[PDB]
Design a protein around this ligand. Sequence first.
Ligand code: 78G
Ligand code: 78G
Lengths: 319, 319
Amino acid sequence: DVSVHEEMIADQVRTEAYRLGILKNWAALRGKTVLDVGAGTGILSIFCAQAGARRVYAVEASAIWQQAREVVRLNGLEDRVHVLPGPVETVELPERVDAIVSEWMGYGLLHESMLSSVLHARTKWLKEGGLLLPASAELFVAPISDQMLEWRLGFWSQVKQHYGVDMSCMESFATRCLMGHSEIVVQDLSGEDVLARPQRFAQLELARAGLEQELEAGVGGRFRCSCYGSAPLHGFAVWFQVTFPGEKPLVLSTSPLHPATHWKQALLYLNEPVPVEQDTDISGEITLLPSPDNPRRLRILLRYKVGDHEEKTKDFAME
Amino acid sequence: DVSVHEEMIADQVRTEAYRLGILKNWAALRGKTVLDVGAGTGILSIFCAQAGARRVYAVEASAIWQQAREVVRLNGLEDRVHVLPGPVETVELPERVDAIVSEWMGYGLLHESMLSSVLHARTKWLKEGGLLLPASAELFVAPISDQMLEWRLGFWSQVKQHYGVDMSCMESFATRCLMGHSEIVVQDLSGEDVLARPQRFAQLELARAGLEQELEAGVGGRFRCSCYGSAPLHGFAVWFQVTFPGEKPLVLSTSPLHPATHWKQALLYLNEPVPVEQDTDISGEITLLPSPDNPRRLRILLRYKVGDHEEKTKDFAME
Ligand SMILES: COCn1cc(C[N@@H+](CC[C@H](N)C(=O)O)CC[C@H]2O[C@@H](n3cnc4c(N)ncnc43)[C@H](O)[C@@H]2O)c(N)nc1=O
Ligand SMILES: COCn1cc(C[N@@H+](CC[C@H](N)C(=O)O)CC[C@H]2O[C@@H](n3cnc4c(N)ncnc43)[C@H](O)[C@@H]2O)c(N)nc1=O
């Protein structure tokens, strides 16, 4: 429970990006009304009030809504920030709003399926031409040679050199266990793990017509790239950024090339490592989907072709 | 599954202590027979063969026994290390053995209740006067001021100074969530978290008559100590060491004052922090017990008295 809220507030990239993304829109928020969808402990609703909003409706479905209300009171804002429990789909606000703010992104952007609630609130409560913060999201994929995974798998074949016992057979076992499943793995990588230039495979203008239907059918696209050097290819990492409109937009990124965040990246491991070399061509397609039992659980459909190998498919679901 | 075996082999304290604890007993093992209870991937059975044992029976109940057999084969030892699947309580060995080795310790020493299987194998299969490795275990307790916990709880009251929003109310919420439960928390501490001299509260000679019954009734004892300085007392940490007989015995320790191991320590948090000062007297009693539904789940009964406060009790069970 509180672990996730701890990780959020200790996430300076997330917190400062929202703080400044909101403050950057002071001109659009001053004297206006805001709806914070999934307000959690309330910090984004306070940010909006501090950016000058005249009234903020902080809607939160989880039990932690009570803490938001106390946060509001401690900051002297009970007169203009109103905390409302329950789902935004049935909350009753006294008025439509000039802006929506929300921290709706999950692991792999869409795990938890929360973007649909923001879109429902936009259709229901946002005035015509109103503001959404963030306004867009972009999805990226890169092939990876996960250095930590390479070490963990390879260490079994190093036991002879550290303890005098050959355990190299455990490398294959570990490979089957760690790579031969179909779960999305959430882990943080660094630039050292990125094996080719990251590719943007989709862009979501959050206000765009039809996005609700696109989320049900699958969001994604094709990609192509060329490997930087000789390495074991372990699979692909997927991450996102979101953009707050401005006049140079502020981007909150979850790329392994950028400061770590609590979203980490979503890793899609092949069943076993594939050796590649400099300039090995990799192409494929990535689709993010709801799981059929539960649209809130992220599913990722991967098609990929490595060099001259045949195209393969692997269908992943969130761990 | 494989995560735990990875953490074991990457644990140089654990692995090197067993390696040298076994090699230290070359005189007792050479040309003799060994039973490795819960042999897992087999490294301890190989160590014994390398210490000169003529035959080693590696008994492993989990599915990973097949990897032990392949490890044995890769090291050319299939003629004298025999991997036997299933529980040691019903394995059939062709002979009684001169020694038992086992890595039976769990979190908080006794979580998983495996020591009972080693004791069953001792009674059933160990020759009279035979060797047990390790031969003894000692249990320690210290009051702690968990610096990481102090930071995590206190950070909510620091949000005003980092983001301009008072969130100090979340400190109390977080305290209730992180401390006001009755779960044993497994976490690694360091010497900076230790608030008084650690106290040995029990010693287990593993070969001693009656230990099986003592494990069912509870293992533990009283302790008393005096605080080093002014700090918030968060509770107590429990850890262990085991000793391999020799001629100066080798000790494998899980103390926070010693190099980290995969056992970490077992933390027993009070419902809320208690301020203490230099020389505040703390006394109490710690009992490790089986959980009533499931003797394999560790239960810890804590009685404690801090300074002039009344004695309190808190009954914990493994997370
Ligand atoms: C890996 O990051 C994912 N992640 C994120 C959060 C953070 N949470 C608070 C953010 C808030 N800016 C803050 O400052 O606390 C966002 C989701 C929150 O929105 C709530 N929510 C969802 N659907 C709703 C609906 N239809 N109507 C109303 N509220 C709805 C949900 O209850 C949760 O509290 C979480 N808590 N867990 C997670 O795993
Ligand atoms: C926090 O550390 C706890 N920890 C430890 C282990 C390590 N494991 C292998 C150690 C082995 N030296 C090696 O080198 O792999 C020990 C327990 C192993 O003993 C097996 N076992 C238990 N009761 C048995 C019975 N009555 N007869 C036969 N085998 C029995 C059990 O199947 C397990 O494999 C684990 N695997 N998980 C855990 O959490």
